[PDB]
Amino acid sequence: VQLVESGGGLVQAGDSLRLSCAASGGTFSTFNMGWFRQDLGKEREFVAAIRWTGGRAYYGDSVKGRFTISRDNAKNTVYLQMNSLKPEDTAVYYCARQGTNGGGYSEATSYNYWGQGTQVTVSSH
Amino acid sequence: YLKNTNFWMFGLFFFFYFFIMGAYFPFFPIWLHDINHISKSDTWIIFAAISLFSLLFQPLFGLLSDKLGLRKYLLWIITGMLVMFAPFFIFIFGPLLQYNILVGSIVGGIYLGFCFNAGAPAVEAFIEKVSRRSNFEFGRARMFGCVGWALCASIVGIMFTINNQFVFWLGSGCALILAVLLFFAKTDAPSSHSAFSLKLALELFRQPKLWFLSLYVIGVSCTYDVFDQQFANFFTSFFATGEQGTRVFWYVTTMGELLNASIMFFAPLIINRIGGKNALLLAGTIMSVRIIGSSFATSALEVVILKTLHMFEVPFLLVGCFKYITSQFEVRFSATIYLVCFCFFKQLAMIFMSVLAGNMYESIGFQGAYLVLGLVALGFTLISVFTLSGPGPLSL
Ligand SMILES: CCCCCCCCCO[C@@H]1O[C@H](CO)[C@@H](O)[C@H](O)[C@H]1O
Ligand SMILES: O=[N+]([O-])c1ccc(O[C@H]2O[C@H](CO)[C@H](O)[C@H](O)[C@H]2O)cc1
Numbered sequence: 001v002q003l004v005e006s007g008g009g010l011v012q013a014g015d016s017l018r019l020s021c022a023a024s025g026g027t028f029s030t031f032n033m034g035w036f037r038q039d040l041g042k043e044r045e046f047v048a049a050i051r052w053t054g055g056r057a058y059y060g061d062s063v064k065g066r067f068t069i070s071r072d073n074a075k076n077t078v079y080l081q082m083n084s085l086k087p088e089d090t091a092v093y094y095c096a097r098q099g100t101n102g103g104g105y106s107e108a109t110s111y112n113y114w115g116q117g118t119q120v121t122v123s124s125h
Numbered sequence: 126y127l128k129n130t131n132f133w134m135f136g137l138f139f140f141f142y143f144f145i146m147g148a149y150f151p152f153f154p155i156w157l158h159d160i161n162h163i164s165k166s167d168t169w170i171i172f173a174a175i176s177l178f179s180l181l182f183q184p185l186f187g188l189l190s191d192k193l194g195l196r197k198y199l200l201w202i203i204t205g206m207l208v209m210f211a212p213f214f215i216f217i218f219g220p221l222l223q224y225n226i227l228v229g230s231i232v233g234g235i236y237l238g239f240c241f242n243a244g245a246p247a248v249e250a251f252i253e254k255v256s257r258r259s260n261f262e263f264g265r266a267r268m269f270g271c272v273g274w275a276l277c278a279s280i281v282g283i284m285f286t287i288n289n290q291f292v293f294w295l296g297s298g299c300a301l302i303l304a305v306l307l308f309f310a311k312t313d314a315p316s317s318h319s320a321f322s323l324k325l326a327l328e329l330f331r332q333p334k335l336w337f338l339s340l341y342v343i344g345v346s347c348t349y350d351v352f353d354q355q356f357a358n359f360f361t362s363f364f365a366t367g368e369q370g371t372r373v374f375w376y377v378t379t380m381g382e383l384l385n386a387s388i389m390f391f392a393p394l395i396i397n398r399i400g401g402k403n404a405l406l407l408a409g410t411i412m413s414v415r416i417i418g419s420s421f422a423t424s425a426l427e428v429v430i431l432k433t434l435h436m437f438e439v440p441f442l443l444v445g446c447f448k449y450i451t452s453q454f455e456v457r458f459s460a461t462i463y464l465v466c467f468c469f470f471k472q473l474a475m476i477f478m479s480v481l482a483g484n485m486y487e488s489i490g491f492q493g494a495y496l497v498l499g500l501v502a503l504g505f506t507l508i509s510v511f512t513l514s515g516p517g518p519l520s521l
Contacts, residue, residue, distance in 0.1 A: 030490025054423035103367015
């Protein structure tokens, strides 16, 4: 099962950039997905993650209180709402799907399927 | 039971034996991955060998342990091989897995399959024979194991970040004091129509009560064990950094097993007055609830409760089964059916069940697979109420 990632591009500081991630293959009953990002040099950083059956969602520190994540069963699609973007949000945002091995949702290594990446750029002027 | 020399001998035996096992079995995967660098997908070959040779030793240990009643011959070999605990993991098993992975798992397959997968229930069946002779309850003995299991977990967690090998050396030492206990323990001495025999043991297979009891094992007991195999990863799936998720898990196991001991203390008093099969049904229910509950969990709090929920089924499964065994079947076979009807047939079904559920972990996923396991565990616990000859829940 792969991972497509819509959205991305250039936005002015303060805009809202809604990302979307769908996939083809299997229903992720149980499976829970998330988002990561990578800037010029920083190792893959965590931003969001969500599971089924409950709005249970997790968010990172630099992202808390601005990004909203939701999911759609059957449609097998999950979206990432971005609001109040600032220039340090520049990066390539990846989609993911958790693995049965590994330890926790906050770590890149714990996600078996990665997406290709979708770069978002944010400038002041 | 109160102060009785023979009880403290075998109560401390469970404490110091499962102190051996608590050093390797719980948190075993973390031994092969974070320290020995085996791939998270390779570990199946090691569990396979351990499973293969436990398949072999379990029917052996069962038939043997019954042939020589309370002679002590079997436990002396085990207690002897347990002295090898430290050099095995540190200098043999470890580096043999850095070498060719296959051979290194054979020596572990035979060693651990012998000392633990098959040795542990053989120790349980033996001390249950001492249970009915020296006048005390088996549950009051085995609760010692839950405390050593816990204390050892407390010691491996503390020492994981500094000198993890330290816990293995304790194992060898514990095995030696495990021998001291076995010497001063008093039972039938060596030099050895109502006795044991293979012929009457194979005629035992023809008994229907065996078939039904077996059905309970592979239907609701095997399913529960495979559910717990990969529960610790599913447990960390509700936490951020894994080393936090595993730390919490290490708290709940240590504390939970203390809770498990306390329950086991009183378990005999309950299992005595409500029947044998009812303990299995109650255990099977706590089991089924833990699977189906984990299928709908959504908060770390909810999943912690589900782990601690394991501590409520163990006392009613262990104390209960022996209390169902030695009433529906002749005591002279108590160690043989427990080792073959429970451990062997459970081990048998766990071969197919483990690879079948592992495909769901990749296809559907954890909680989704837990829903199927929960239905069959719950399902087989239903027909269990009618199949198992005995009183039942109605008897109230
Ligand atoms: C340095 C660690 C101290 C542990 C010492 C354990 C002593 C071993 C006791 O020997 C055994 O006694 C049995 C009767 O009890 C005999 O049946 C058997 O033939 C004999 O081998
Ligand atoms: O390989 N075996 O044969 C085997 C392994 C573990 C085990 O665990 C029970 O003993 C533990 C200590 O008492 C815990 O209480 C645990 O929760 C119980 O289920 C029993 C048998």
